[PDB]
Design a protein around this ligand. Structure first.
Ligand SMILES: *[C@@H]1O[C@H](CO)[C@@H](O)[C@H](O)[C@H]1NC(C)=O
Ligand SMILES: *[C@@H]1O[C@H](CO)[C@@H](O)[C@H](O)[C@H]1NC(C)=O
Lengths: 119, 173, 107, 173, 173, 119, 107, 119, 107
């Protein structure tokens, strides 16, 4: 079946940079898009950006423009999302989701990676 | 597959088309987008389900027939009954094989026809405002190809206010 | 950016009740609202891709309807396994925006 | 294998085409008028009449056969005779249904193909003199009277004497 | 329904192909030339050989059957055996006629489709650098050193430098 | 069956205007053209004009350019002639004819409306 | 305006013989001449259209042929129900001009 | 059967012009090209020219530019060769070859016409 | 002009031997080498066309292969009727040049 394996918990110091991972298995990684959703405990779901694994097409949200950078690895079928200059507002649960294309609904979601940005 | 679209100028299909069978996909200034064509998809489903209503169900009732398994040897009548049953089984097996092969060929030809029909309908809608690149895509030359003047490729493309042939359609480098 | 609104942030409904969750858009999204189910452990699953189209593996209890700016999700046979947070998302104008959520509770 | 002409870009049939099956129709400065195309009509009529030759008229002579109606009730032989007759009737009924469906589908595909072929022929006649309006009519961008209209319907098209006048109006206008 | 190439737009055949079925034949400044297209020829050969694989070599073993020739004259059993054999022979003769006619029609449709597919592939490759003369030829509006003729046939032809020159040659006076 | 009903006889004073009628029934009024023929007792048949009921296309004879005006009523399936300035030379029998298009024979004719222009 | 003329303005013939109504045109019409039957009670019907095709309801007795400028209509088995006036009409060039008419009579 | 009948042997004085013949029989003459090959008694085969019988298309070798002139007769199905200004180096055996086209191979050859150019 | 060379001008091979004739071109011809056999009485026939296809009537013992500039002609079992002069000719560029010719002898 389609699975999106994600990291469990990463402890990162504030002001540093982290590179999350989302391993894709059970389907062809090239032909399905990968998104990234951030959910705060006190807020709703927030879409960050999307990536096309075929040719690395990037289009992010206006709020998360310099914060996140989406890259893929077609050899290992893993999609990365590099966060830069982590602050206290960036401490939330990050989900990776497979949609099908840009405007298509997210079919399968990852387990979610909690990223507590604290000292 | 005689129209040469599904295995022809379209190099591969699109995994992720979860709503329709045929569709449009673009990359303009407002980002990538996909939509499905309901009319061609519905026509293909209509013909295939017509085949399905012809085949599924509609079973003739045969209550009393001849004996088809014999535990002893009699002679003329046994040989005649076995010959009749073998003839019926062979004829119906040939009918089933020919029907399956012909209907599969017609289904593939219908799919190719619907894909070529959608492609030619889009080409006739675009007229001289777009060039076919041979990959099944249409290089559309004016602006806002499928965001604001390209959701109207449901039958309502103006193709007159965007007669932009001077940009790159007829231009020198 | 189109703002997704869900006024019923917390809703209470017992077993066997037809609970309706409504998501309202700022303007017409043209039949492009998705429904997501976030279980309290943290697993998110798509239930109704677009409107009135069930995702694979989704039980027949979940259903959707609506057009224009008003869309609704119906759970006719709510069970303890169906108690989760429910989100609404558009697929019309970048950026893709989600709703405030709707958490179901036992009265 | 629908070519998408009889139900595609041609929106409706022409009730008033009393002679011929396929035809042209113009709009000039000398008035409206229309006429039929003999070649495509004759080809479609030829194939349909050929189906009529292989169907109508050719019957096999069956003089002596077996009894098909029985008034008494003997078992083994009357049940093999009834089984044989029922098998023959079912096989020939299936053959008739499949033949009628296949010939009707081929006739509809042929009549679509003749319209598409005549459309493509008159499209290739006017290379840059006309544009596909997508409704079946061609916007021919030059002063064409009934002489050149009948030349297009004729096969004596020139497409070179009107090329300058049909290239200025096509682009600059 | 046939396409319009084998006997229609492609006028009279060539007879010079001794290696392939479909192909190209040009006239450049370096002289005339002929070359075959391996892909369409191989596709047509593959489907025709498949149709031959359904028929040639595939026979059913029928060891013991009923008697089909009777020296004496008898009643019900002999009449029933003759009726069964005549029914089987007539049904298989109808099946053979229908199969032969359907496969011949599909072979003609396949060859017409392959010729039209090769023509449409060449037309999509040439973009706006060549024109449809209606004879099946392509008036290519840019000169070349036979490298373009080589690159069209395999499929490695681009617009290259020969786009502005081709447009200038097409749109003059 | 197909019929083209007409009025029998209209008594019109000279110098006036008349509106003849030709009710069409038994066929689709849009798909078939309607023509108009005038027959004098001492002359032959004279074609006046044609009308296309789909979009009201008018093409008249040169002799009857300023004399007749052809209109249709798609709701009641009727075709009208607006004769203007009737004189002694306009006293003839007027027929309405269904053809199919402009360049096609008149399939079915009307009964004939005699128009005696006299006092 | 193409002038359409008929030589025999009034043809006299008995019952049961073939009559040939000749029709002459000014310019050259390819096959666009047709025949109308004007019965003496005012009823007009179309008999032969486009010089070879038989109109619906017309008996096989009526026939026509011709090409260029000379055109003919054949009534081989003239019956008492066939007494009328016959007209020509061009469908080649606007305006559509008719003939002078040919009124038969019983000899 | 397909064959290319030629003349036996022509004894031509030096400095004169000769018109060799290659009669074609057994195939459609206008649909197959005709070539001309000269074989010296000591050297090998040398291609001279090719002709398209449909429209008399000519393309000769660079060395045999002004020497050969290829013509056809579609009525008699014969292909001629107007050799002009024969010298001592022109005394060789001349063959005519059928072909599918210019680049298609020499399918069938004639019997060869020996042309002794001597006084 | 493409110079066409055949180094083995005279080759001696007995009956039943697999004789190999090699033809080399200056530029690359793309599998457009053709093989001609000239009998000693003057008759010339085409044996292998486009280096891999048998001409009609040619016995199956004749075969060919090669690519680029080097091509070969293989006779599996020599026969007394196979004693002839063999030529190689290109089909790539004008003029269509031939080989030097390989004459076959008996040891
Ligand atoms: C139409 O074609 C025919 C024969 O092809 C000939 O009369 C002439 O070339 C054309 N006539 C007109 C009026 O175009
Ligand atoms: C044309 O195709 C051939 C393969 O048959 C190959 O050499 C290449 O792809 C093309 N030729 C050139 C010179 O690029």
């Amino acid at each position: 079946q389609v699975q999106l394996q994600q990291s469990g918990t990463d402890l990162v110091m504030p002001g540093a940079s982290v590179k999350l991972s989302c391993k894709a298995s059970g389907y062809t990684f090239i032909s399905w898009w990968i998104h990234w959703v951030k959910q705060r405990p006190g807020q709703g779901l927030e879409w960050i950006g999307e990536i096309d694994p075929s040719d690395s097409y990037t289009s992010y949200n206006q709020k998360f423009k310099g914060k996140a950078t989406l890259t893929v690895d077609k050899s290992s079928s893993t999609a990365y999302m590099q966060l830069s200059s982590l602050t206290s507002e960036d401490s939330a649960v990050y989900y990776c989701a497979r949609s099908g294309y840009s405007n298509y609904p997210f079919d399968y979601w990852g387990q979610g990676t909690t990223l507590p940005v604290s000292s | 597959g005689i129209f040469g679209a599904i295995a022809g100028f379209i190099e591969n299909g699109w995994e992720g088309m979860v709503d329709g069978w045929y569709g449009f996909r673009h990359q303009n200034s407002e980002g990538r987008g996909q939509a499905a064509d309901l009319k061609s998809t519905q026509a293909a489903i209509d013909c295939i389900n017509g085949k399905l209503n012809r085949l599924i169900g509609k079973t003739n009732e045969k209550f009393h027939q001849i004996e088809k398994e014999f535990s002893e040897v009699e002679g003329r009548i046994q040989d005649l009954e076995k010959y009749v049953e073998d003839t019926k089984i062979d004829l119906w097996s040939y009918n089933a094989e020919l029907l399956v092969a012909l209907e599969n060929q017609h289904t593939i030809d219908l799919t190719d026809s619907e894909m070529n029909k959608l492609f030619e309908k889009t080409k006739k809608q675009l007229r001289e405002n777009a060039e076919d690149m041979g990959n099944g895509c249409f290089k559309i030359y004016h602006k806002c190809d499928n965001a604001c003047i390209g959701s109207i490729r449901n039958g309502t493309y103006d193709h007159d206010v965007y007669r932009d042939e001077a940009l790159n359609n007829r231009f020198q480098i | 950016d189109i703002q997704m609104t869900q006024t019923t942030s917390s809703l209470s409904a017992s077993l066997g009740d037809r609970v309706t969750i409504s998501c309202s858009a700022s303007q017409g999204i043209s039949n492009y609202l998705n429904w997501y189910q976030q279980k309290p452990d943290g697993t998110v699953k798509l239930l109704i891709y677009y409107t009135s189209s069930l995702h694979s593996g989704v039980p027949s209890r979940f259903s959707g309807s609506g057009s224009g700016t008003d869309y609704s999700l119906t759970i006719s046979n709510l069970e303890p396994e169906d108690i989760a947070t429910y989100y609404c998302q558009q697929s019309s104008k970048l950026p893709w925006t989600f709703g405030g959520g709707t958490k179901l509770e036992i009265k």
